[PDB]
């Protein structure tokens, strides 16, 4: 029927003045309150851009090109060996040329390539979903490159808004982090062109999504509240149980596995079991911002240029947390190093200048009892598995850990504080295992690599647990 | 590796 479309409530739309704009991770701090509650929110840029996209990439960046990959919108079910041919079948493009492209098929689909009013192309889309003959679009996801202009005059490729300096912002919780990741800590480019979508997902570690578009036809994004994530997975199911926007119907899957063997649902029917659906019609100059945990989902109107990158702020850390078990469940090996996370934050905290920790927002007040409270409890569960441990007399070595974070070889979960190594060094778990039980090609021998500073942090953790709000 | 996600 596609009524529901026109009856979906949008999310908020922010409009800050310069003075007001600061950099993404401050305002998101001022606004969060209200914005955290939609899972998706809208921010439009006061700041524009002196030298343009299309500009920036032919003229500051050499011969730019990138290669697409191919998408299947709508079709009887794909199996994974034909899913997987097709996926980067895509040919090679320029700017130019794949511009060119994109606006040559829309005009073939609709006798003009003017864009069109949106409410027409997003019933397009869910009905082109459900019964078009059209079987594939190109989207040139994921291609590493920027179109902030690297020009000093530029004064949105001078701001802190720039996609580029947002990861190593003060805020930024990754911004201790050791090496780059891309799309992490580094933006990545979207290419997109009419009815190019991304499926439903909730980003890797729940982390913050900040997208901006450069240039192009407007992008529709339907965000789920962070509060609705398990009810929207909930919903999932059962619909696919229900045989209602059936999958390959595999039935053994992590949750994330059956979304992406999904046709792309419509939002009703999240809205008829109750699940909130809040609206976002991107256009040029306009951040979208994506909340830890928020479901998302989307389609271009046309040929459109947009840029993103995912962070963290320490509200995040409690979601960060709930990733972590997941990842764990499902045996996987984690994305960040979410322990060295919480010490390196943590221990910034303790010890701060102090002259810097007093009149500040309730959400960065929050954010920092989370990292407190995510810190107090991960020295404890150290604290007395290392007595275990001791007392066990299994524990034969005690070293001075002075490596990165390591992968635990059974979980999988990351290890920054402490692991039991074995004898050949290929079979090293964290302390969530019980040693006696370890049976290792190797040998019996487990020796307990920890860091050298788990005193001053043992210290911090009886500090941040006798404060306000930490318990 | 360190990165994003799709399917090749
Ligand atoms: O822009 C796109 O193609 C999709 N964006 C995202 O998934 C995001 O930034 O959360
Ligand atoms: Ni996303
Ligand atoms: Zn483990
Ligand atoms: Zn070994």
Known sequence: DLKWTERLPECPVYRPTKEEFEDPLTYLQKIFPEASKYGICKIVSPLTATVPAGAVLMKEKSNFKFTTRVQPLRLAEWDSDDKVTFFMSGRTYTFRDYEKMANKVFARRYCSGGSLPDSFLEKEFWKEIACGKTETVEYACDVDGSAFSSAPGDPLGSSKWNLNKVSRLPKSTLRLLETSIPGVTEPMLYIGMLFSMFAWHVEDHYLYSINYQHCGASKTWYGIPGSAALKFEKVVKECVYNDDILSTNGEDGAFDVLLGKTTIFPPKTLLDHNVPVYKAVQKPGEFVVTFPRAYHAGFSHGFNCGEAVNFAMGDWFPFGAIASCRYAHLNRVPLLPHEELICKEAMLLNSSSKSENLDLTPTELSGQRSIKTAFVHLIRFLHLARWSLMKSGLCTGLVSNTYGTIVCSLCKRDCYLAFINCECYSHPVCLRHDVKKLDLPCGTTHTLYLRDNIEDMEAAAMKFEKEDGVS | ?8
Do not use: I, L, Q
Not at chain 2, 1 to 8: D, E, V
């Open chain 2, 1 to 8: 590796a360190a990165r994003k996600s799709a399917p090749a």
